[PDB]
Amino acid sequence: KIPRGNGPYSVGCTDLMFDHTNKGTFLRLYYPSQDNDRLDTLWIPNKEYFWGLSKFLGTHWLMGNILRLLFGSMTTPANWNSPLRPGEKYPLVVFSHGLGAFRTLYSAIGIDLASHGFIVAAVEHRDRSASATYYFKDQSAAEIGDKSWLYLRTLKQEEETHIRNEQVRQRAKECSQALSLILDIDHGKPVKNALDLKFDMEQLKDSIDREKIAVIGHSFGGATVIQTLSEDQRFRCGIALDAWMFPLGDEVYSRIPQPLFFINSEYFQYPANIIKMKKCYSPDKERKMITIRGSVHQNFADFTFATGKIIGHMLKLKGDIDSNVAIDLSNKASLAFLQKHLGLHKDFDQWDCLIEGDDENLIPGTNINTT
Ligand SMILES: CC1(C)CC(=O)N(CCOc2ccc(F)c(C#N)c2)C1
Ligand SMILES: [Cl-]
Ligand SMILES: [Cl-]
């Protein structure tokens, strides 16, 4: 089971696609909810995501069918289409998923954030870095629900540098676009959700704390944080979760004025990557780095909760550290950082010491030597 949020607020979930096209925004929203008696949220909502995952793993599509059998009824503890908790303006996080992932696979993070009074928009990227995603060819297709699917692009070695950079720039634009959509809904612009879901978007009117915006993401999503910050000053700070730095252009490193927090796994990182993170540092800029002891790259994503301890460790979905312990640290340290750099008036400064890696399961900075 994917853990429930640790915060005081109940959590709701829904999906927004606007416009309906491959250039529209697709996101999963996690938000403080008024009610706590709704059905839980289906974790991986369509069979095609499992086919996507099968291609990402480099297996036959029939492994996709097997993955569906195993995981296709799994839920995540968020009240599907629950009304938004009224009477308060919430800060906003835009969240960016990893390569071969998609919008629904970081619910442990999204739910926890929402339970502390954030609205979280987990974008689904259309750069062919998602295992799968979908949209509609035209207005007619959107009405009848005739989905067009877009699957993960496999690269040749000679395409890697160039295409990963094209992808990270698209990802950043998608983050900025998702922000604009949410800010426009906040004002009260009518938006007809291309998905026919019983969550009225007008609830979001006057519900966003409009200057309190952050961008967070895992791996490819971590590079996306960085690209996004350099190009969109509306994002006040960023948190990169085990960032994969390879996609970034040489130009971006000196171009990130906002506070930036690197939260790393012990076992993912390597000198080339760490060197790139250190290129983000300058005397006038606020940077923080911590490393979670005993953790692996997948501790930041939901599949760390989806299997047992023995299978999970074999598949590199789990580390030596307990998955809930690990995500608690990442999520609490994130909260403290956000409160600091968004100027929130909550109690998240109780976790300030985690920003400095002061905890028995944290390493300050990095375990990686780069000399
Ligand atoms: C360094 C990379 C190749 C680049 C990158 O982004 N990486 C993270 C991928 O993270 C995934 C993928 C698929 C999933 F289903 C889940 C989950 N849950 C997580 C590895
Ligand atoms: Cl790893
Ligand atoms: Cl290296």
* Look-up of token digits 């580390």: 319
DSSP designation for 335: H
Q: Rounded to an integer, what distance in angstroms lies between the CA atom of residue 239 and that of residue 214?
A: 8
What total number of domains does the chain contain?
Answer: 1
Q: Looking at the CA of 244, name the nearest ligand.
A: 1
Q: Rounded to an integer, what distance in angstroms lies between the CA atom of residue 92 and that of residue 115?
A: 13
Q: Which residues contact 26 (CB under 8 A, 6 or more apart)?
A: 15, 16, 17, 103, 123, 124, 126, 133, 134, 135
What secondary structure does DSSP assign to 88-115, as a single string? S-EEEEEEEPPTT--TTTTHHHHHHHHH
CATH number at residue 23: 3.40.50.1820
How many Cα atoms within 13 Å fall on the side-chain side of residue 209? 19
What's the 368 CA to ligand 3 centre distance in angstroms?
Answer: 10
Residues 222, 240: contact at Cβ < 8 Å?
A: yes
Query: Burial code of 184-198, b = ≥16 C-beta within 10 A, e = fewer?
Result: ebbeeeebeebbeee
Q: Rounded to an integer, what distance in angstroms lies between the CA atom of residue 81 and that of residue 219?
A: 29
Q: Rounded to an integer, what distance in angstroms lies between the CA atom of residue 218 and that of residue 239?
A: 9
Q: Which residues pair with 40 in a beta bridge?
A: 79
In three-state secondary structure terms, 166 is: helix
Residues 274, 368: contact at Cβ < 8 Å?
A: yes
Structure tokens at 365: 């900075």
Q: Which residues pair with 18 in a beta bridge?
A: 25
Residues touching ligand 1 (Cβ under 6 Å) are 53, 98-101, 105, 219-220, 244, 301-303
**Atom from ligand 1 closest to the CA of residue 131:** 13
Ligand 2 ion: residues within 5 Å (CB) = 267-268, 296-297
Quick one: which of 29, 25, 81, 46 has its CA closest to 196? Answer: 81
Q: Which residues contact 211 (CB under 8 A, 6 or more apart)?
A: 236
Ligand 1, pocket-test mutation among 54, 244, 246, most atoms within 8 A of CB:
244
- 364 φ/ψ angles, rounded to the nearest 5 degrees: -65, 140
DSSP designation for 22: T
What's the longest Cα–Cα distance across the chain? 59
Which one of 97, 116, 218, 297 is the catalytic residue?
Answer: 297
Structure tokens at 345: 């008036």
In three-state secondary structure terms, 349 is: helix
What's the 297 CA to ligand 2 centre distance in angstroms?
Answer: 4
What's the 277 CA to ligand 1 centre distance in angstroms?
Answer: 19
Q: Rounded to an integer, what distance in angstroms lies between the CA atom of residue 336 and that of residue 306?
A: 27
- 71's enclosing H/E stretch is helix 61-71
Q: What is the CA 159 to chain-centroid distance, rounded?
A: 26
Please report, for residues 119, 136, 194, 199, 311, the alpha-carbon distance to residue 18 in angstroms, rounded to integers and kept in the order given. 18, 11, 6, 14, 39
Q: Rounded to an integer, what distance in angstroms lies between the CA atom of residue 354 and that of residue 26?
A: 33
Structure tokens at 304: 């760390």
Which one of 15, 232, 242, 302 is the catalytic residue?
Answer: 242
Q: Rounded to an integer, what distance in angstroms lies between the CA atom of residue 126 and that of residue 81?
A: 24
Q: What is the CA 41 to chain-centroid distance, rounded?
A: 17
Please report, for residues 44, 150, 209, the alpha-carbon distance to residue 241 in angstroms, rounded to integers and kept in the order given. 22, 26, 24
Tell me, yes or no, if 140 is annotated catalytic: no
**What is the identity of the amino acid at 89?**
K
Quick one: which of 36, 217, 208 has its CA closest to 110? Answer: 217
Q: Which residues pair with 92 in a beta bridge?
A: 119, 213
Ligand 1, pocket-test mutation among 219, 224, 295, most atoms within 8 A of CB:
219
In three-state secondary structure terms, 146 is: coil
Q: What is the CA 93 to chain-centroid distance, rounded?
A: 9
Strands 25-32 and 119-123, sheet pairing = antiparallel
- 332's enclosing H/E stretch is helix 323-342
Which one of 10, 219, 323, 330 is the catalytic residue?
Answer: 219
Q: Rounded to an integer, what distance in angstroms lies between the CA atom of residue 195 and that of residue 16?
A: 7
What's the 313 CA to ligand 1 centre distance in angstroms?
Answer: 16
What is the dihedral angle through the alpha carbons of 77, 328, 182, 251, rounded to the nearest 10 degrees?
A: -140
Residues 362, 344: contact at Cβ < 8 Å?
A: no
Tell me, yes or no, if 297 is annotated catalytic: yes
Strands (E), 203-296: 208-218, 237-241, 260-265, 287-292
For ligand 1, atom 14, the nearest C-alpha belongs to: 101
Q: Rounded to an integer, what distance in angstroms lies between the CA atom of residue 268 and that of residue 287?
A: 20
DSSP designation for 209: E
The residue range of the domain holding 49 is 1-371
* Neighbouring C-beta atoms of residue 215, cutoff 10 Å: 33
Q: Rounded to an integer, what distance in angstroms lies between the CA atom of residue 358 and that of residue 143?
A: 53
Strands (E), the chain: 11-18, 25-32, 40-42, 75-80, 90-96, 119-123, 132-135, 148-151, 208-218, 237-241, 260-265, 287-292, 362-364
Strands 40-42 and 148-151, sheet pairing = unpaired
Q: What is the CA 249 to chain-centroid distance, rounded?
A: 21
